[PDB]
């Protein structure tokens, strides 16, 4: 399924090229402009432990997830990943624990040394 496809086919978008964040564009967006650091960003997402079935979904809360880009309000993989996305794009991310919740994890939702998968739709973004 989706996680294995990102392992096999995803682009490494880390600076270090450690395969810590892998991305596939699943639907192309429009802009030739990505959000910049500090921007207010609006997304829908579905997220799960890479080995794991049950998703966490913004849809469950009946509203978009909103955060300021590059301010560490989200895991590092999101600050890296969403900075590469255009408005309307849907991307898949597969994330090693170094770019997510590391050795400590974040219980009870995330255990130690967890790989995460996300599908993210970039809905909108506005400058600070
Ligand atoms: C670690 O706590 C959660 C993690 C996630 C979902 C949660 O609730 C729906 C979590 O409870 C906290 C309340 C909501 N929240 C999260 C964040 N800010 N607010 C930022 C920390 O989260 C993140 O940076 C990432 C990316 C942005 C969406 C949420 N997110 C998560 O890591 C999810 C987890 C995805 C993998 C499966 C378990 C939830």
**Please, which residues have CB within 8 angstroms of residue 58's CB and are 6 or more apart in sequence?**
43, 44, 45, 46, 64, 65
DSSP strand pairing (21-27 vs 90-95): antiparallel
Question: Does the CB atom of residue 124 touch ligand 1 within 6 A?
Answer: no
Residue 92's CB is within 10 A of a number of other CB atoms, namely 21
Supply 15's token pair: 């600076």
Q: Is 99 a catalytic residue?
A: no
- For the Cβ of 110 lying below 6 angstroms from any atom of ligand 1, the answer is yes
Token pair for 18: 């450690």
The data reach a resolution, in angstroms, of 1.8
CA distance to 3, 41, 47, 107, per residue, from 84 (Å): 19, 13, 18, 29
Is any atom of ligand 1 closer than 6 Å to the C-beta of 59? no
> Does residue 95 carry a catalytic annotation?
no
| Cα(48) to centroid(ligand 1), Å | 10
Q: d(Cα 50, Cα 114) in Å, to the nearest integer?
A: 8
Cis peptide before 108 (omega within 30 of 0): yes
Report the C-alpha gap between 97 and 5 in whole angstroms: 18
| Contact of 116 with 49, CB cutoff 8 Å | yes
16: which DSSP letter? S
How many secondary structure helices (H) and strands (E) does the chain include?
2, 7
- Please name the residue whose Cα sits nearest to atom 22 of ligand 1: 74
Pocket test for ligand 1, best of 47, 104, 111 (most atoms within 8 A of CB): 47
Instruction: Ligand 1 pocket test: pick from 50, 74, 85 the residue with the most ligand atoms within 8 Å of its Cβ.
Output: 74
């Amino acid at each position: 399924g989706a996680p294995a496809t990102v392992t096999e086919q995803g682009e490494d978008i880390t600076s270090k090229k450690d395969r810590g964040v892998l991305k596939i564009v699943k639907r192309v967006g429009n802009g030739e402009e990505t959000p910049m650091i500090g921007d207010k960003v609006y997304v829908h997402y579905k997220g799960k432990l890479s080995n794991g079935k049950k998703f966490d979904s913004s849809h469950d809360r009946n509203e978009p997830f909103v955060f300021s880009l590059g301010k560490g309000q989200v895991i590092k993989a999101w600050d890296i990943g969403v900075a590469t996305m255009k408005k309307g794009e849907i991307a898949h991310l597969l994330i090693k624990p170094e770019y997510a919740y590391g050795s400590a994890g974040s219980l009870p939702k995330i255990p130690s040394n967890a790989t995460l998968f996300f599908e993210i739709e970039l809905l909108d973004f506005k400058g600070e």
